[PDB]
C-alpha cells in the first residue's frame, strides 16, 4: 500500500484513516511546524501492538501513539431513550491491550489514539474526527482518559437544556467510558475521571477541519507530556484557533497530502527510525501524473471565465515536463531540443494549482526553478551552439 499525492485535497475536504498516517511523517521533518524530534526520541522496544513507542528526552516518560486504523470508530445514539451506542470491536480490542500494557508498566505513560465518532440515529452521514488521550501513572495505578473535540464548546445561542440533554446526547462519552471502564474491569487500576476538552469555540454539525485540528492536537499532547507542560488548546492558554492551528500548520499538512507520495513502509520507518523521509524525484513525477489524470476529467478550477489556459494547454505541458524527468531519473542527458520545448511550457507549469505543485518539489529538490533543476542535465553537444 502507498499514499498517493492528492492534488485536489484541501483541509476542508476531510481527514481519513490513510491521510492522517501520511502526516505522521511530518513529526520528524525539521522543516515542518509539527516537529517532535527535540521533545522525544523513539523508544527501542515498541512493546505495544499497533502503536509507536517514544521516550521523552526531558521527562523520561513513555508515550505511545496509535497508527490510525479506522475501523477505530465510536457511534452514539442521539435519541436518549435508546442505547448509548457501540465502540467498534477493534477500538475495544486496543483499549483492553492498553490496560494489559499497563499491567506490566514500570514508568508513566500516555496513549494517543485518533478516532472518528458518529451519530447512528441521524440519517445524515456526519462523520467527525476526535482524539483520545489515556494517561497512566504507575505509582497511582490510575488511568485518566481525555478526549479532545474540535467542534467543542456549545454556544448558548444553541445549547441543549439540562432537560433535553436528558433526551438527546450531543456526543459519545457515555458509550466510550463504558468501554474504557469495561476494558480495565480485570485489573487493579482505578479509573480517574473522564474529561472532554472542547476547544475551537463553535463549529458545525460536524466539519472537515476537525481532523486537521485533531492531528495538531496529537502534536501538542505529545509535546506537553514529553516536557511536563499541561496540554493547551483554544480557550485554555490559547486565544483563537488560528494561533493553535496556524497558517504554517496548514501549509505543511495540505502539502504533504497534495504533492507528496509515500509507501506505508516509509512512515513505519520514519516513525520507528526517528528519521525524516526526504522528498525524492519519483514523488514529483507521480504528483504530475495525478494532476494530469485529475485535470483531464473536466476540471472546474478557474474554468468558467477569464481562462488563460485550457485543459489541452495544461496537459500538453504536464506530459512534456514528466517526459523530461523520467529521462533524468534513468540518469540520462536532455537534448537541448527538449530543454527548448520545456522553457516554452514553463509559464504554463507555474500557473495556478500546477504552480504550487511544481513549487513544492523545486524547493524540496533544492533547485531555484525548473531550469536550474533540468539545466545541469542538458546536452547541447556540440551544435548549436
Three-state SS across the chain? CEECCCCCCCCCCCCCHHHHHHHHHHHCCCCCCCCCCCCEEECCCCCCCCEEEEEECCCCCEEEEECCCCCCEEEECCECCCCCEEECHHHHHHHHHHHHHHHHCCCCEEEEEEEEEEECCCCCCCCEEEEEEEEEECCCCEEEEEEEECCCCCCCCCCCCCCCCCCECCCCHHHHHHHHHHHCCCCCCEECCCEEEECCCCCCCCCCHHHHHHHHHHHHHHHHHHHCCCCCECCECCCCHHHHCCHHHHHHHHHHHHCCCEEHHHHHHHHHCCCCCCCCHHHHHHHHHHHHHHHHCCCCCCCCCCCCCCHHHHHHHHHHHHHHHHHHHCCCCEEHHHHHHHHHHHHHHCCHHHHHHHHHHHHHCCCCCHHHHHHHHEECCCCCC
Residues 310 and 257 occupy one common structural domain = no
Dist CA 190 CA 178 (whole Å): 14
Place of cell 458518529: 118
Structural contact between residues 6 and 258, judged by C-beta atoms closer than 8 angstroms: yes
Q: Is residue 51 part of a domain?
A: yes
Torsion angle in degrees (nearest 10) through CA of 246, 12, 160, 73: -100
Dist CA 19 CA 87 (whole Å): 22
Grid coordinates belonging to 359? 513549487
Q: Report the sign of the C-alpha dihedral through residues 181, 187, 193, 196, in that order.
A: negative
Q: Can you give the residue range of the structural domain that contains 244?
A: 2-272
Residues 12 and 137 occupy one common structural domain = yes
Residues 123 and 243 occupy one common structural domain = yes
Q: Is residue 188 part of a domain?
A: yes
Give the list of residues 6+ apart from residue 41 with CB closer than 8 angstroms, or none.
Answer: 54, 55, 57, 274
Dist CA 27 CA 191 (whole Å): 31
Residues 317 and 353 occupy one common structural domain = yes
Dist CA 259 CA 1 (whole Å): 18
Dist CA 35 CA 23 (whole Å): 11
Dist CA 230 CA 224 (whole Å): 6
HSE at residue 177, side-chain half, CA atoms within 13 A, is: 14
Q: Among 234, 253, 272, give the residue marking a domain's end.
A: 272
Q: Is residue 385 part of a domain?
A: no
Structural contact between residues 288 and 321, judged by C-beta atoms closer than 8 angstroms: yes
Q: Among 205, 238, 272, give the residue marking a domain's end.
A: 272
Dist CA 175 CA 82 (whole Å): 12
HSE at residue 142, side-chain half, CA atoms within 13 A, is: 6
Q: Among 255, 272, 289, give the residue marking a domain's end.
A: 272
Grid coordinates belonging to 57? 528526552
Q: Is residue 384 part of a domain?
A: no
Bridge partners of residue 148, in order along the sequence = 131, 197
Residues 27 and 105 occupy one common structural domain = yes
Q: Is residue 362 part of a domain?
A: yes
The gap from C-alpha 251 to its chain's centroid, in whole angstroms, comes to 12
What's the first-to-final CA gap in the chain, in angstroms?
48
Rg of the chain (C-alpha set): 24
Dist CA 364 CA 362 (whole Å): 5
The CATH number of the domain holding residue 207 is 3.40.395
| Domain count across the chain | 2
Residues 231 and 298 occupy one common structural domain = no
Place of cell 540520462: 332
| Technique that determined the structure | X-ray
Q: Is residue 312 part of a domain?
A: yes
Residues 195 and 287 occupy one common structural domain = no
Report CA-CA distances (Å) from 173 to 90, 125, 170, 276, 381: 18, 19, 9, 36, 71
Residues 268 and 345 occupy one common structural domain = no
Report CA-CA distances (Å) from 180 to 18, 134, 153, 176, 193: 25, 10, 23, 6, 11
Residues 300 and 249 occupy one common structural domain = no
Residues 199 and 344 occupy one common structural domain = no
Residues 226 and 316 occupy one common structural domain = no
Residues 296 and 353 occupy one common structural domain = yes
Dist CA 129 CA 110 (whole Å): 20
Grid coordinates belonging to 151? 467542534
Mutual orientation of helices 352-364 and 281-296 as an angle, nearest 10°?
Answer: 170
Amino acid at each position: 500500500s502507498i499514499y498517493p499525492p492528492e492534488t485536489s485535497w484541501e483541509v476542508n475536504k476531510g481527514m481519513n484513516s490513510s491521510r492522517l498516517h501520511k502526516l505522521y511523517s511530518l513529526f520528524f521533518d525539521k522543516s515542518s511546524a509539527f516537529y517532535l524530534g527535540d521533545d522525544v526520541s523513539v523508544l527501542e522496544d515498541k512493546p505495544l501492538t499497533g502503536a509507536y513507542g517514544f521516550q521523552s528526552k526531558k521527562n523520561d516518560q513513555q508515550i505511545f501513539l496509535f497508527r490510525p486504523d479506522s475501523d477505530y470508530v465510536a457511534g452514539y445514539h442521539v435519541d436518549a431513550k435508546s442505547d448509548a451506542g457501540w465502540v467498534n470491536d477493534k477500538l475495544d480490542r486496543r483499549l483492553s491491550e492498553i490496560s494489559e500494557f499497563c499491567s506490566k508498566a514500570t514508568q508513566p505513560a500516555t496513549f494517543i489514539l485518533p478516532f472518528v465518532e458518529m451519530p447512528t440515529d441521524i440519517t445524515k452521514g456526519v462523520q467527525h474526527q476526535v482524539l483520545l488521550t489515556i494517561s497512566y501513572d504507575p505509582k497511582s495505578k490510575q488511568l485518566t482518559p481525555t478526549v479532545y473535540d474540535s467542534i467543542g464548546r456549545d454556544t448558548y445561542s444553541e445549547s441543549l437544556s439540562s432537560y433535553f440533554k436528558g433526551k438527546y446526547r450531543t456526543t459519545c462519552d457515555e458509550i466510550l467510558t463504558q468501554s474504557i471502564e469495561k476494558a480495565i474491569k480485570s485489573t487493579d487500576f482505578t479509573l480517574g475521571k473522564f474529561t472532554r476538552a472542547a476547544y475551537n469555540h463553535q463549529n458545525r454539525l460536524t466539519e472537515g477541519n476537525s481532523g486537521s485540528y485533531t492531528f495538531r492536537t496529537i502534536k501538542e499532547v505529545i509535546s506537553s507530556s514529553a516536557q511536563g507542560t499541561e496540554v493547551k488548546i483554544p480557550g485554555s492558554g490559547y486565544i483563537t484557533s488560528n494561533s493553535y492551528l496556524t497558517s504554517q500548520h496548514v501549509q505543511d499538512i495540505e502539502s504533504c497530502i497534495k504533492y507528496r507520495n509515500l509507501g506505508v513502509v516509509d512512515i513505519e520507518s520514519a516513525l520507528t527510525e526517528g528519521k525524516t523521509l526526504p522528498v525524492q524525484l519519483s514523488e514529483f513525477i507521480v504528483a504530475l501524473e495525478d494532476y494530469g489524470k485529475l485535470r483531464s476529467q473536466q476540471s472546474e478550477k478557474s474554468m468558467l471565465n477569464f481562462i488563460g489556459y485550457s485543459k489541452t494547454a495544461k496537459l500538453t505541458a504536464v506530459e512534456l515536463l514528466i517526459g523530461i524527468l523520467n529521462d533524468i531519473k534513468g540518469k540520462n542527458e536532455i537534448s537541448e531540443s527538449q530543454y527548448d520545448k520545456l522553457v516554452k511550457e514553463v509559464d504554463c507549469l507555474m500557473d495556478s494549482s500546477l504552480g504550487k505543485l511544481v513549487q513544492f518539489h523545486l524547493k524540496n529538490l533544492g533547485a531555484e526553478s525548473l531550469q536550474k533543476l533540468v539545466l545541469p542535465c542538458v546536452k547541447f553537444d556540440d551544435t548549436i551552439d
